[PDB]
A paper describes a structure:
Since the auxiliary subunit KVβ2 was reported to promote expression of hKV1.38, we expressed hKV1.3 with KVβ2.1, purified the complex, and finally obtained an overall 3.2 Å resolution map. The angle of the S4–S5 linker is similar to that of the KV1.2-2.1 chimera in open conformation.
Voltage-gated potassium channels (KV) play vital roles in electrically excitable and non-excitable cells. In these two structures, the VSD is in a depolarized conformation and the inner gate is open.
Numbering used by the authors:
A (entry chain B): 494 to 503
B (entry chain B), C (entry chain D): 103 to 247
D (entry chain A), E (entry chain C): 36 to 361
The structure:
Amino acid sequence: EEQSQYMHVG
Amino acid sequence: GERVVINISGLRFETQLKTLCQFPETLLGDPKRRMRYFDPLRNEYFFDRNRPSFDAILYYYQSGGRIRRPVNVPIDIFSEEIRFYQLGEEAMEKFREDEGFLREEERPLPRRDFQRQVWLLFEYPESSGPARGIAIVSVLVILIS
Amino acid sequence: GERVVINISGLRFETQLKTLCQFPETLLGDPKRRMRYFDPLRNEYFFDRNRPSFDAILYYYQSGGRIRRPVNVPIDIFSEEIRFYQLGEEAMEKFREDEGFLREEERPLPRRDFQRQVWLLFEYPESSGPARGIAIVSVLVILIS
Amino acid sequence: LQFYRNLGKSGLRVSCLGLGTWVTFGGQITDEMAEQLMTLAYDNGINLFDTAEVYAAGKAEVVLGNIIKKKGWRRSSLVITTKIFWGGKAETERGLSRKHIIEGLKASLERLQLEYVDVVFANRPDPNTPMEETVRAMTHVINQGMAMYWGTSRWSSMEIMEAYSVARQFNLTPPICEQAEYHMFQREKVEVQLPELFHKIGVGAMTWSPLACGIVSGKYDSGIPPYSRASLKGYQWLKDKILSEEGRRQQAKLKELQAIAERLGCTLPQLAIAWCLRNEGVSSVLLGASNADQLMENIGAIQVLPKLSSSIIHEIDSILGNKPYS
Amino acid sequence: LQFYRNLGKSGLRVSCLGLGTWVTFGGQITDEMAEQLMTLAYDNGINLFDTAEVYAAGKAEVVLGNIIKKKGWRRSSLVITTKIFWGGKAETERGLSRKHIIEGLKASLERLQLEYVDVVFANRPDPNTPMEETVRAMTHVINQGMAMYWGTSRWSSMEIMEAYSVARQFNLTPPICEQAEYHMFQREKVEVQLPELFHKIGVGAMTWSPLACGIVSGKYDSGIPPYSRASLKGYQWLKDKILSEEGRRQQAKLKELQAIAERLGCTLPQLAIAWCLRNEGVSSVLLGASNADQLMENIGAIQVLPKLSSSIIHEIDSILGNKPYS
Ligand SMILES: NC(=O)c1ccc[n+]([C@@H]2O[C@H](COP(=O)([O-])OP(=O)(O)OC[C@H]3O[C@@H](n4cnc5c(N)ncnc54)[C@H](OP(=O)(O)O)[C@@H]3O)[C@@H](O)[C@H]2O)c1
Ligand SMILES: NC(=O)c1ccc[n+]([C@@H]2O[C@H](COP(=O)([O-])OP(=O)(O)OC[C@H]3O[C@@H](n4cnc5c(N)ncnc54)[C@H](OP(=O)(O)O)[C@@H]3O)[C@@H](O)[C@H]2O)c1
């Protein structure tokens, strides 16, 4: 989740 | 019935208008949001966006909800295009379980001030100072034993 | 405001002019370098270059600096296209750390003639004759010991 | 604000009012009044004159061609329009085919004694003819020089967007205008559908009958006055619209609106005409007068327009209550 | 070097000077001088004659149509141009709409007594009309045969590139020329913007007023001489430009330039005219003369041009100092 959710949720 | 032409930076896509009228909340499906992208000299909409990413955005309108991702476009680029086309948070969350990254689980609270102080104090050792101090002593009790 | 058409050997790309005016040093961003590629009968620029490589060169202008590489185009072909479009040595060096090959480290020098002779003589055994002769004896001293 | 405005997004600059033509010219009123009508409108800065080939069986054009011939005005200063669709009892003399557009316009330029009209209008949609034949026929008469622009009238908003997508496909000319009905009791089309098209493709609006053919003039309360429009023959559809109780439900709304016109120092026509021009999406308003005193008091409905503030608009809406769903 | 050159990249070959028309024809000078003016220019190899429909309220064309009718020259040997934009006080008689281009050119071919002009110019840009209507109207009058080519005048460099991209999009004809002002004190546009367009799309330049309407002729130092241009009525904008001290700052630069013309065996007009033709990017220079002796000494400004070497150019630049940022 250091590359995935860093630009996923927004 | 009639069709629309969408021009993603030189690449032409043509769907019927009623396909975009399945999802009348997004950018392409709302007739007052896309009116600033129209091109009256060519009778089409011109977006200066990513070329290979719109092939997956178009399939979301045709299939009725399935969000895929091509191999070429990365995660940080395909995620912006969902944000730009305003596909919605239900469409954005389908990019999670398609990719495999599961959503975060919401933890329940004991709806007080005493028990809400002590729940986050031991279960979540990264919260406060002695929360990190309760973890450094919780490793000793098992290790001596 | 107005847009340009670029024709990479039959494939049409269309971006706004101000996107090419972000980087006013390169080939596409400098209005006197690309003027010999213009085609006044079609109002476009015709390049007889690699087709699938320009999709990545166009994204470098839109994203503001990110240099990717498609799977199809090799390293020796995508590197020529950066050299042909004159994207710059900062753009060329971004093809290094994207690909993973790190830059060479510059070694400091002792700014003399005596110490600059003897620094490259033992630390760099591939320099001279006895530099290769100091390596063949430096393996013995540890091996006897 | 502005007296001369562009017809849509074209280059044509029309006055914001234009003396139309119906039952009056060649029919009800005499031709001595009509020359006196047109000189009173031309001298007050109105250049847009409108007619059609069906009006008084093609006699409203002959009496308009004699006026411009007699008065000696420059053709480059006026804007003459003309509608096409009904031009005879024959089967092949009514429609928007390629045969009727070329022959109906060529006969109207013999009645009007001109060499070209400025706008030529399709009077109503035709379901028989395909859309490609009407756009190719209207681009032909433009390229011959029989017209300068062309517009639609009583079309939908989906049919204009279909006649625009043919013109861009086959490299022809799209329409520039649209004549839709718009007064205080008919405001559905021009207030929610046509301003969508102006922002997209740039067609304008040019509204007609702003007094509902005399009903909003306020003369139709105590009954049918003599020498009025409802008292004529063939206008029973009008007379039995006001004599019906839905018209009496409309006369009960022109009593409260009667008082506001005296509050602003005007009369009920000048409130009714200047209410239509309160937007920017309407490029012209086509009046119709029966004598000189009606036209003079209607031309002076420009001074009423700066008084039409948002307070007085929003209470008129509270009287009528027919504001469309934005 | 060459006397006849191509107008841009077209096929039209014009003489490098052309006797224009302004206040002189039909206004200031008499028509007896004008026939004597034009025969003195036609016999010296100048074919390009220029006019417009606004010059002396449309009397400069009637006096030019009588000369070609009387002298009996072949129409296939001359190049007549004409500008369009101001053609009446009416609202619909000024602009670059489809209505005015077709009617303003049709009336000018009745004044000039011709059947076609060779180039028709848009006199200035129009912000009201869209660019598609002007390109479609100029391609219509070409395809009717009322003109052969068309050009722009006082347009920007971004507007010409926009009227070129419409012509290639909709399959119409692009412009071939551009009339921009260019003399010794106004050299910004023709020296850095227009040579970009010639290498790209092939439009030419055809400069006008090369003596700044008589200022660079050197007659405006001691004051206002009688029977000069500044002494006329309505030309107070000219007279109060030279009488202003920025013009006296310009007369203090025509003293040093006065001496160089005597060093090269010429006068100050012939230096000023031949300085404009020193490039290749200017296809013609439109003079304006008031009598025969002015035109004869201006026609002979071709022999000065081989003396205009790079040494004498670079010191003139050191006098003026207004060389644009290349
Ligand atoms: N596109 C189409 O298919 C279509 C269809 C119909 C009409 N039109 C156009 O619409 C234009 C307008 O025609 P219209 O007559 O319906 O417009 P209108 O202005 O609504 O009609 C007003 C009528 O009431 C009367 N009137 C005018 N001013 C008055 C005033 N101050 N006080 C009292 N009465 C007054 C006049 O004669 P009276 O007093 O005798 O009543 C006039 O006939 C026509 O010329 C035609 O070109 C187009
Ligand atoms: N595209 C546009 O919008 C536009 C606008 C304006 C003009 N133009 C064109 O420009 C053309 C040139 O007109 P222009 O008069 O401004 O050019 P110009 O050559 O700069 O004007 C010279 C003026 O000075 C005088 N003169 C000429 N030769 C002279 C000489 N050797 N010695 C002393 N005086 C001399 C003449 O009359 P005086 O002695 O009485 O002063 C003449 O009027 C016009 O014909 C018109 O077609 C185009």
